[PDB]
Amino acid sequence: TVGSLIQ
Amino acid sequence: TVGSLIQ
Amino acid sequence: TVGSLIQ
Amino acid sequence: LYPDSPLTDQDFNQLDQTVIEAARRQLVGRRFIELYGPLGRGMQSVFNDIFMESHEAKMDFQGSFDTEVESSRRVNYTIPMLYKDFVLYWRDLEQSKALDIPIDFSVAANAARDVAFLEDQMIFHGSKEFDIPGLMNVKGRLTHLIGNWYESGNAFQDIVEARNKLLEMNHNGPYALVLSPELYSLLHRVHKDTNVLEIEHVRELITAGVFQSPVLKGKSGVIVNTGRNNLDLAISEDFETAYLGEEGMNHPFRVYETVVLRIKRPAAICTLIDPEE
Amino acid sequence: LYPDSPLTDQDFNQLDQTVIEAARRQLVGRRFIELYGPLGRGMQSVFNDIFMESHEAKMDFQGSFDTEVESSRRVNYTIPMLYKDFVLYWRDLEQSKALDIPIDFSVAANAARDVAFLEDQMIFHGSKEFDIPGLMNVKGRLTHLIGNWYESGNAFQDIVEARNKLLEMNHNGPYALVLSPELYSLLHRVHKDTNVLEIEHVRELITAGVFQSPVLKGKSGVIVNTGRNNLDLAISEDFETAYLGEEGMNHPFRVYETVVLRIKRPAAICTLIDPEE
Amino acid sequence: LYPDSPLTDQDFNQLDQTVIEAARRQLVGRRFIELYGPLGRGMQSVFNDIFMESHEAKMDFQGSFDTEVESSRRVNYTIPMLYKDFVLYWRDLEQSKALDIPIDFSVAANAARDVAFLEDQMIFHGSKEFDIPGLMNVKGRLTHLIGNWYESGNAFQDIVEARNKLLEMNHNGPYALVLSPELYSLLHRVHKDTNVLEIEHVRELITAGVFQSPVLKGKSGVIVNTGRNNLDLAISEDFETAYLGEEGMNHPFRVYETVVLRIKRPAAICTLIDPEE
Amino acid sequence: LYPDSPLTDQDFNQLDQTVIEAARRQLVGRRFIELYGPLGRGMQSVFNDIFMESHEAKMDFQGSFDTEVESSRRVNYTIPMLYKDFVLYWRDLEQSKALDIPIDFSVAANAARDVAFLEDQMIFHGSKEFDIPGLMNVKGRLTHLIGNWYESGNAFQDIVEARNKLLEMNHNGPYALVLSPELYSLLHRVHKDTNVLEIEHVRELITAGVFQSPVLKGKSGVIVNTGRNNLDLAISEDFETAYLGEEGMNHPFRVYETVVLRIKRPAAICTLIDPEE
């Protein structure tokens, strides 16, 4: 459950 | 038995 | 049956 | 997949889109720090091992009879919560429903900006009520002072001397630079007798990106190498929304996030403080 | 699976994932050098017959029943160890197994990055423990001075004479240039009177990578041509991790790989030295 | 396929590939010169015929009766063999199957390095023992001075003058250029005030591969135009690896090649000669 | 081997029973030195640990947790070859082939006699080309000076000094003793009014033999402690014979043997240096 990773 | 083998 | 022919 | 709300579930996940779509546009802290997976709800503390000492390998012969390891110095941390709340009115939600206009959530995208900037201070200057150290507040951080950044070309000179203090303590590889908005404007000058832009003349040596964040002050700057073993962003929940009920007659909400910044090896950070004093 | 293995099998491959992924982004030695066959456990010595001259003859009619061969210069080498160790704690493994998160390995990557730097320091300088000659200390290696590699376009002009000295010794083909990070910035300026970058004038002239290795001094660089029967890397064992006996209550470890470079023909190297001291 | 050998049929084919991989990488004679058919071993002498500025045509209306052909001046050349021999040792070959390592073959590439280099020394300078002339020894070859094209823009100006001297004798067609390495490195500067290297303006004026070779010692260079009706070399047997028994618990070998060069029209060669006087 | 060599499989052993039985009369090298195993043909290089330090055992009721070991200082050697070749005769082999008498190999006993003396040249002085140290050339080897080895009873006095010089370094056990043929022709003799044979007073202290080797050409000798734990020689291939070819019309052969001696503790050798200069 990961929502917002950019890099 | 290898496993790095960089060009 | 020639060995090595380069252009 | 939602129990009860004044929104359709087809409409509710449009709100989860725009709360992360206007969040990754703003974030610069997560740009070069590989964070973690999730941690679930049942974890309110994290451990980090401040190593503070590192050395090379050995190559002698068939082996040795000991395990030469570094020190650990285990420190316990706690996980804060960063949040911001917004309100979504009745009589505009009702008015958009009667004559079928798609509802705007442009308060929520404004709300996830402020929770992604309040997150960006604790990753640089660090908290105080939980005393989590920031990226410019740790002990043993290899400081470096400079001055007069814009005369001819000494901008590029001023950081090769900075990485040499970071290279002699056995830290190399992929680097990263974060500059304040005052310093980033000065780096777009044209180079003398190189005849290329000075920012492009330095982006091949740092090799994983220069950045610009408004969380810094005026004359400042931080160069740190990336990867794991040096930096970590242990996380427990990402940007989730939550209903709060029908208090009064309108509908409020709350976005929240739970992060910490654990620094493992503090000797692999540098600091361009740049004073005149 | 041979040992008693405090880790199970499905996450033991995550250690073999991390220890070889963090090694790939740091290994510049074998990015242009041909690689020998894995000799196995049963060989712990190697030789190389150093050739240095020409000895051209035999332009006559049929027959001439004789035999004339060349000079050997045989020497034997011993394969070194190149190990580095690390440690995993219990009561941190059981915690990651209880609430079911995947285990961290942010200390195995520091062990993998450490061995892959000493393995790169050995090949470019040689070891005095076993008299293995490095890539810059080998005997008869065609040195060449530099003379102000800074400005106006005598950087690309200085490569062509260094390319020329390999050409007079009947050596050509795919060259490969490895030079220091402080000199790699000097191939970024525009070439005079043509307004093209100088590194585009030399990527057509070397035909392999113009690399950049951090294990070097200031003004220094080396140009060599690749291939087998010129120089190669005798390998015996790749990056395998070994489980030491769980001493006390914790679980230590050790990564290791045993490798040695052998130079067959030392005349096919050229070294940019710049002696200005 | 063999009569008999101390090797394996799958392995003796690998020796034949090491000797022709390291041949194509070396010689420059058979790159711009058309080949003759493989005559086998039945031929032992070849016949060529010089022509030297032949006759004219007719412009009649109805024809004529007698046939008028030009002169021949037949000279009979003889075919030599060029060779160099190498040995595979008794101890090292027998050890490589006791612990299952594929055999080294770096001696064979060092032996094909020789016999291909001596094959260029025969075509560019001629063998005195058999009296066959080279490309710088032939009788009547349009010599032309170079006038020290060193630093100015007379590099392009001088080899367009050689192409003019050869064009006024009705020799059009794709010319080729072979230069000394002292001159080939000199040709890589920028053309004066016209933003291109000299080597790109030249290669459209020649269009069949300006080459180089270290067999030209001083400052020199030849320029020919190709064509099987003008210049070719007669092959009879290419690089085969013979076997010579065994003397002293060792296995010798021999690589060999039989070829001559017969020039037909000597007014197709032009020679840059460098009077430094 | 058998490439249809002109000897059957049955009378080839009579060539080996002549070599292996005429060699062991002449060999005083391996009469007090323990053999290593047959290393085979996968081995060309051996290691040996030069200890040069000692310790002692312990005595208690239960075991101790710690572990005590020594230092090694590994040195690598190569394995030289030793040959000498003979030649049989057609019209002399063909007599015994056609008359069915046993073919003589009396030349082969003379050939194998020389390679035994060349072994004792190597095992007592060390080959200088492969730098392997001899039994008289090793470093740290307990010198001792002698005087006037001719008078009545001046030998057993002069040999009890060298034992006690070696006994204080805690090396007590069966000592061997090799003497130059001048000394062995001077130890037991006839005297003036003393009539002591002077060897039965020395045979009891020594109890591993007093030999006589003609390799020590001056007048000197050594006292060595025996044992596998102190020094041993390594065989890669024992006394073998082979068949070269058929040069002319006769048959040559070659005896050969590959031996290197490795010392482990050089402080258990005492050399009678003989001041005579």
Residue numbers in the entry:
A (entry chain E), B (entry chain F), C (entry chain G): 3 to 9
D (entry chain B), E (entry chain C), F (entry chain D), G (entry chain A): 6 to 282
Q: Which of the paper's sentences describe this entry?
A:
A newly discovered class of protein organelles called encapsulin nanocompartments have been shown to be involved in microbial iron storage and redox metabolism.
The shell is composed of 12 pentameric and 30 hexameric capsomers occupying icosahedral vertices and faces, respectively. The four capsid proteins of the asymmetric unit adopt different conformations with significant differences found in the E-loop and A-domain. All pores in the IMEF-system are negatively charged on both the exterior and interior surface due to the presence of conserved aspartate, glutamate and asparagine residues. The 3-fold pore forms the largest channel to the IMEF compartment interior and is 7.2 Å wide at its narrowest point, substantially larger than previously reported encapsulin pores.
